[PDB]
Every structure is written in C-alpha cells, then in structure tokens.
C-alpha cells in the first residue's frame, strides 16, 4: 500500500478544531467518510499522510476544544470493534489484542525545558446504557483503565485501581470509584524520531503492554478482575497532556491492528 496500514474500518477520529455544524464539540469522522481524511478541510490539517515514509501523522496542541469528560485536546482515534457503530465494545473477558508501529515525530518543550507529555494508547472503559441507565448517568463514560504516555524519554504506563475493594456494583460503575496506580516505565528509552512498538494483550483479568517485542508490563491483580464489568474500546494517536501556550506533538502511525 501506498499508506500507512490502518483499517480505516473500525476507527473513528476526532481531531482539535472546532465542529462548524456542533460549535463547542471537536470535529470527528467515522465510517466511511474518515476514508476521506486526506481531503477533509479540516482533519486533514490533523490526521495526514507522509508519503515518504507511508505513516500517517497525528498533529495536536491546545486548541480550546475538547470532548465532554476530556479536558485536553487530541487527534486521537476510537476503536469501533463493529464497522459504523459505537455501541458495541469489548470486555476483557472477550479479550482484544492492539498492536501499533509508533514513532514520535515532533513535541514541544514546556517553559522548564522538559518535553511536553503525549498520550499514544488507551483502553477506555465504556458503559453500557443499561448500567448508564441503572445508575443514571448523563452519558455513558467509564474510567481509561489503561493510558500509555511518551513522557521525557520513556514510555510510560498509567493503570486504574479501584478505591474501596467492598464498593458495591453500582458503585463500581461510577468513575469516582477508580484512582490511579503509581505508574510503571518501560526500561527501554525510546527517543524522538525513532520507530517503536507498542502491543497490547487483553484477556479475562489480564492486561500486558509490549515495547519493542521485548520487556512486558502484566497487570493481572484483583483491579483488573473488578474491571471486568466494563465494556471497552481502544484509542491510539495523539491526546497531547498539555495546555501550555503554543506546546504540541505529531505522532506518526506506520502499522496499526487490532483483533477480537
């Protein structure tokens, strides 16, 4: 292929300029219209092809225009494990493999000369809408039980845990019943401009996140049994952790699988 290998078929990209036609909410595009991205006045500007090395670029800064639960801007892509729909999402009894060829293109520094942080992978909790609706929540968000960061020189791993091991259900499902862990680093530093990879393996009560085919990061504790009452979704791209003035980051996307 001409371009980088992404199934277009079962993502969705939203991207940080403003929708024209839903002022206030980031522009996206799903199926199949995202085929389309390297003609779309705006995305575009934020998911493009470089045709010289077939990867496809993730371009994100502060923007001012972000999603409901968000809080940063991204040019961020949502699995759809179902081609067109965004309903049907995976527990992690069913499992899901995510495997992606990354490299980090360009960041900024923040003013203490530090680089700015990216996230570049996220399994994201979903609701469904009989739990949405059971505890009456105003939409169907769910904690991110996994976040990968590119944060000075390392990757790093950022995994949810639940607060109170006795909450009971309804409880569980609300995001305030899930804090953070401590975080983990990869041992391997992964400099700029450099291509690595990223995989992640997810099956009944067990997350593992590869770098470079080499070191594993397995999280298979009582947290990750109790989050076995979510659905969820992959994300991979460019969720910029900064609002600093003119700070960004491109990251590029070479190869990019995912399999149920």
Do not use: C
């Not at 203490?112 to 009989?130: N, P």
């Not at 991110?144 to 109170?164: F, M, N, S």
């Not at 862990?181 to 700029?192: P, Q, T, V, Y």
Request: glycine content about 6%.
């Amino acid at each position: 292929s001409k371009t980088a290998k992404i199934d277009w078929s079962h993502w969705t990209v939203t991207v940080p300029e403003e929708n024209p036609d839903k002022p206030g909410k980031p522009y996206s595009l799903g199926y199949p219209e995202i085929l389309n991205y390297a003609e779309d006045k705006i995305a575009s500007k934020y998911m493009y092809d470089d045709p010289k090395d077939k990867s496809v670029v993730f371009y994100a800064f502060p923007s001012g225009v972000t999603t409901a639960n968000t809080h940063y801007s991204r040019s961020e892509l949502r699995e759809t494990m179902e081609t067109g729909s965004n309903k049907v999402n995976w527990t992690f009894a069913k499992g899901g493999k995510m495997r992606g060829t990354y490299a980090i293109d360009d960041i900024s520094k923040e003013p203490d000369g530090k680089y700015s942080r990216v996230i570049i992978a996220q399994i994201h909790g979903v609701l469904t809408d009989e739990q949405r609706d059971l505890i009456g929540q105003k939409d169907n968000n769910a904690p991110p039980i996994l976040k990968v960061y590119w944060d000075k020189g390392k990757i790093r791993v950022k995994t949810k845990v639940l607060k109170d091991l006795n909450a009971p259900y309804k409880e569980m499902l609300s995001e305030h019943a899930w804090g953070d862990d401590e975080g983990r680093n990869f041992k391997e530093k992964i400099d700029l401009n450099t291509r690595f990879t990223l995989e992640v393996k997810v099956s009944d009560g067990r997350m593992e996140v590869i770098l470079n085919d080499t070191e594993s990061l397995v999280y298979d504790d009582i947290h990750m049994k109790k989050w076995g009452i979510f659905e969820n979704y992959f994300k991979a791209g460019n969720y910029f952790q900064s609002k600093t003035p003119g700070t960004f980051a491109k990251v590029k996307i070479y190869s990019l699988q995912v399999t149920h």
